């Protein structure tokens, strides 16, 4: 048959999105992982990069 049994299309949406899950910690710049503020400068790469 064929690969790709799924299609995704772009949309325009007025609907609001609440995806902004809060991060009290440090939001990693590239990865956006929410690391605890205590893990900065501990010598471990707890974020990415």
């Amino acid at each position: 048959c064929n690969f790709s049994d799924k299609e995704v299309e772009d949309c325009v949406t007025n609907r609001p999105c609440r995806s902004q899950v809060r991060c009290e910690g440090f939001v990693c710049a590239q990865t956006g992982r929410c690391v605890n503020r205590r893990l900065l400068c501990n010598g471990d790469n707890d974020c990415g990069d």
Partner: protein, 57 residues
């Protein structure tokens, strides 16, 4: 911004008062009680303000 402490100074304060201000903030999973206080110097205004004088002078 936060509201000022706007409360009027009351007659029960007149010798002196102490303002303490505090909040608990519970960031991450751990609470910290945060607080400050200042000494308030209030006028020695009497509540009844009794005054005495002789009628002739």
């Amino acid at each position: 911004s936060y509201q000022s402490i706007n409360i009027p100074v009351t007659q029960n304060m007149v010798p002196s008062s102490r303002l303490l201000v505090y909040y608990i903030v519970t960031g991450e999973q751990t609470a910290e009680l945060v607080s400050d206080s200042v000494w308030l110097n209030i006028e020695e205004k009497c509540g009844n303000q009794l005054q005495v004088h002789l009628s002739p002078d």
